[PDB]
Enzyme design. Sequence first.
Site, mmCIF file in Angstrom:
data_model
loop_
_atom_site.group_PDB
_atom_site.id
_atom_site.type_symbol
_atom_site.label_atom_id
_atom_site.label_comp_id
_atom_site.label_asym_id
_atom_site.label_seq_id
_atom_site.Cartn_x
_atom_site.Cartn_y
_atom_site.Cartn_z
ATOM 1 N N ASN A 1 -14.068 -4.812 2.402
ATOM 2 C CA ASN A 1 -12.597 -4.965 3.243
ATOM 3 C C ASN A 1 -12.403 -6.297 3.803
ATOM 4 O O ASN A 1 -11.554 -6.383 4.632
ATOM 5 C CB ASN A 1 -13.033 -3.974 4.495
ATOM 6 C CG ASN A 1 -12.757 -2.436 4.273
ATOM 7 O OD1 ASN A 1 -11.976 -2.201 3.301
ATOM 8 N ND2 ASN A 1 -13.300 -1.579 4.944
ATOM 9 N N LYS B 1 -17.197 -4.133 5.727
ATOM 10 C CA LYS B 1 -18.059 -4.498 4.672
ATOM 11 C C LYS B 1 -17.136 -5.323 3.628
ATOM 12 O O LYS B 1 -16.133 -5.479 3.750
ATOM 13 C CB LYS B 1 -18.179 -3.065 3.905
ATOM 14 C CG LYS B 1 -16.965 -2.306 3.352
ATOM 15 C CD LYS B 1 -16.917 -0.961 2.960
ATOM 16 C CE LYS B 1 -15.625 -0.320 2.606
ATOM 17 N NZ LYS B 1 -15.549 1.159 2.116
ATOM 18 N N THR C 1 -18.946 3.441 5.065
ATOM 19 C CA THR C 1 -19.756 2.980 3.675
ATOM 20 C C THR C 1 -20.945 3.208 4.305
ATOM 21 O O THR C 1 -21.540 2.254 5.148
ATOM 22 C CB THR C 1 -19.134 1.913 3.069
ATOM 23 O OG1 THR C 1 -18.039 1.902 2.759
ATOM 24 C CG2 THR C 1 -20.226 1.869 1.675
ATOM 25 N N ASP D 1 -15.704 0.337 9.568
ATOM 26 C CA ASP D 1 -16.029 0.192 8.127
ATOM 27 C C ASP D 1 -15.786 -1.160 7.613
ATOM 28 O O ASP D 1 -15.188 -1.096 6.728
ATOM 29 C CB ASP D 1 -14.730 1.303 7.641
ATOM 30 C CG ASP D 1 -15.444 1.467 6.070
ATOM 31 O OD1 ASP D 1 -16.723 1.622 5.742
ATOM 32 O OD2 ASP D 1 -14.542 2.010 5.239
ATOM 33 N N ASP E 1 -7.814 -2.672 5.780
ATOM 34 C CA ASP E 1 -8.437 -1.395 6.038
ATOM 35 C C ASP E 1 -8.423 -0.758 7.234
ATOM 36 O O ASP E 1 -9.781 -0.614 7.900
ATOM 37 C CB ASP E 1 -9.518 -1.490 5.196
ATOM 38 C CG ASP E 1 -9.855 0.264 4.622
ATOM 39 O OD1 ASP E 1 -9.075 0.886 4.417
ATOM 40 O OD2 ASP E 1 -10.999 0.539 4.753
ATOM 41 N N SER F 1 -0.014 -8.598 3.590
ATOM 42 C CA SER F 1 -0.570 -9.757 2.739
ATOM 43 C C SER F 1 -1.004 -9.601 1.479
ATOM 44 O O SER F 1 -1.873 -8.868 1.334
ATOM 45 C CB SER F 1 -1.494 -10.496 3.689
ATOM 46 O OG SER F 1 -0.921 -10.897 4.905
ATOM 47 N N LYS G 1 0.881 -1.113 0.073
ATOM 48 C CA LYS G 1 -0.082 -0.053 0.123
ATOM 49 C C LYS G 1 0.854 1.193 -0.081
ATOM 50 O O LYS G 1 1.784 1.463 0.891
ATOM 51 C CB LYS G 1 -0.843 0.084 1.199
ATOM 52 C CG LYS G 1 -1.954 1.418 1.137
ATOM 53 C CD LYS G 1 -2.564 1.319 2.496
ATOM 54 C CE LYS G 1 -3.791 0.487 2.414
ATOM 55 N NZ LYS G 1 -4.774 0.551 3.369
HETATM 56 N N1 LIG Z 1 -7.704 -0.760 1.851
HETATM 57 C C1 LIG Z 1 -6.715 -1.644 1.997
HETATM 58 O O1 LIG Z 1 -5.877 -2.045 2.838
HETATM 59 N N2 LIG Z 1 -6.602 -2.681 0.935
HETATM 60 C C2 LIG Z 1 -6.044 -3.755 0.649
HETATM 61 C C3 LIG Z 1 -4.716 -4.120 1.551
HETATM 62 C C4 LIG Z 1 -4.091 -5.249 1.341
HETATM 63 C C5 LIG Z 1 -4.483 -6.140 0.331
HETATM 64 C C6 LIG Z 1 -5.498 -5.673 -0.658
HETATM 65 C C7 LIG Z 1 -6.096 -4.620 -0.614
HETATM 66 C C8 LIG Z 1 -5.489 -6.613 -1.722
HETATM 67 C C9 LIG Z 1 -6.240 -6.737 -2.754
HETATM 68 C C10 LIG Z 1 -6.320 -7.723 -3.768
HETATM 69 C C11 LIG Z 1 -7.375 -7.503 -4.755
HETATM 70 C C12 LIG Z 1 -7.200 -8.518 -5.620
HETATM 71 C C13 LIG Z 1 -7.641 -8.757 -6.820
HETATM 72 C C14 LIG Z 1 -8.093 -7.663 -7.753
HETATM 73 C C15 LIG Z 1 -8.896 -7.909 -8.838
HETATM 74 C C16 LIG Z 1 -9.161 -9.398 -9.209
HETATM 75 C C17 LIG Z 1 -8.854 -10.248 -8.484
HETATM 76 C C18 LIG Z 1 -8.994 -11.768 -9.095
HETATM 77 O O2 LIG Z 1 -9.346 -11.942 -10.178
HETATM 78 N N3 LIG Z 1 -9.181 -12.820 -8.030
HETATM 79 C C19 LIG Z 1 -9.620 -14.048 -8.413
HETATM 80 C C20 LIG Z 1 -10.705 -14.757 -7.555
HETATM 81 N N4 LIG Z 1 -11.875 -14.218 -8.185
HETATM 82 C C21 LIG Z 1 -12.318 -15.004 -9.412
HETATM 83 C C22 LIG Z 1 -13.655 -14.765 -9.970
HETATM 84 C C23 LIG Z 1 -14.248 -13.306 -9.896
HETATM 85 C C24 LIG Z 1 -13.704 -12.745 -8.440
HETATM 86 C C25 LIG Z 1 -12.332 -12.909 -7.945
HETATM 87 C C26 LIG Z 1 -8.401 -10.154 -7.263
HETATM 88 C C27 LIG Z 1 -6.336 -9.418 -5.097
HETATM 89 N N5 LIG Z 1 -5.972 -9.011 -3.987
HETATM 90 C C28 LIG Z 1 -4.673 -7.726 -1.417
HETATM 91 O O3 LIG Z 1 -4.357 -8.731 -2.033
HETATM 92 N N6 LIG Z 1 -4.011 -7.406 0.003
#
Ligand SMILES: NC(=O)Nc1ccc2c(c1)=C(Cc1cc(-c3cccc(C(=O)NCCN4CCCCC4)c3)c[nH]1)C(=O)N=2
Length: 276
Positions: A137, A134, A162, A132, A150, A87, A38
Site C-alpha cells: 500500500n 503495508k 493483511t 491496512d 488504499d 496519482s 481505479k
Molecule cells: N489499491 C489501490 O488504491 N491501488 C493503487 C492506487 C493508485 C495507484 C496504484 C495502485 C498504482 C500502481 C502502480 C503499480 C506500478 C507498477 C506495477 C508493475 C511494475 C512496475 C515497475 O516495473 N516499476 C519500476 C520500478 N521498479 C523497477 C525494479 C523492480 C521493482 C519496480 C510498476 C506502477 N504504479 C499507481 O501507480 N497508482
Amino acid sequence: PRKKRPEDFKFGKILGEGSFSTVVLARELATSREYAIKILEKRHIIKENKVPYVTRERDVMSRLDHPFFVKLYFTFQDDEKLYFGLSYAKNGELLKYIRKIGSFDETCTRFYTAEIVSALEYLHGKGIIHRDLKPENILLNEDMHIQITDFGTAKVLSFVGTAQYVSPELLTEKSACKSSDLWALGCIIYQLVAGLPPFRAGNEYLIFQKIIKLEYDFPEKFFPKARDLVEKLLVLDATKRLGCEEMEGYGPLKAHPFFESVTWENLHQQTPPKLT
Ligand SMILES: NC(=O)Nc1ccc2c(c1)=C(Cc1cc(-c3cccc(C(=O)NCCN4CCCCC4)c3)c[nH]1)C(=O)N=2
C-alpha cells in the site's frame, strides 16, 4: 470542469488487481497526462455490501492534501462501473523493492521510515486511521518518494488488514485505533531491515497466534537503534507505543535516536538515498 468520460482516455496496462477493483494506467487524450484509474463494478460492490467502503475511500481521499499520499483528481461512472482518477506512482509498490534488493541499508531504512512517519502524523492529525498499512500500500513515484494509497478500509474517527501487519487489539477486543497503524509501522521497519516481516507462519491462524504472544526475534545484524525503535512500537498494549497519544504523540517518536540525522520539515523536497 466537465465530468470526464471513459472515451476521454486511452487505457493501457493493468497496474493492480484486488477483490473489488482494478487499477488501470490511462492516458488522457486532451492533455497526455497519465493517471492510475481505479475501476469498480457497481453490481459487485452492491452484491458484496461494499458501498460504505467505496464511499469512505472517496470521502477520505478528498480530505487528504499532502505529498506522501496518492491524490484523487476526478471521479465518474458509466452504467456498470465507477472510475477514480488517481496519482500514477510510476515505480510501483515498495514491496517490489524490498524483494528486489533483499534488505535496506540503514540510510535508506531511516529515510523511508521517516517519510512513513510524517505521513502517519498527517493522517492521524486528520483523525483518520489507515487500518491496512503495508508495503503493498506504499507506492514510489518517479522521484522515489512514497505515496500511500488504499483508503476504502480506513476508519475516520469490522475490518482486519493483511494478517502479518494486524495489531493485537484487532485480534483481542476487536477495536482499532491510531496506535494500530504504529504497530504496522513497527512491522514495516522490521521488514525493511530484516527483509521479512516479524510475524510469519504457514497460515493466518498461526500468524495471529504469534502476534498476540509477541512471538518474534531480531536478526543479529539488525541496526541497534532501529531495533530499539521497533521494540517501542511492537508493544501489545496500544497505549504504550511510541507515537500514540498516551505517549504524547509524534514529538517523542520523531525525537527517537534512530532518526537523529533526519530533517523532518521538508522530506519530500530531499533527494532520496539510492536503493541498493
Ligand atoms: N489499491 C489501490 O488504491 N491501488 C493503487 C492506487 C493508485 C495507484 C496504484 C495502485 C498504482 C500502481 C502502480 C503499480 C506500478 C507498477 C506495477 C508493475 C511494475 C512496475 C515497475 O516495473 N516499476 C519500476 C520500478 N521498479 C523497477 C525494479 C523492480 C521493482 C519496480 C510498476 C506502477 N504504479 C499507481 O501507480 N497508482
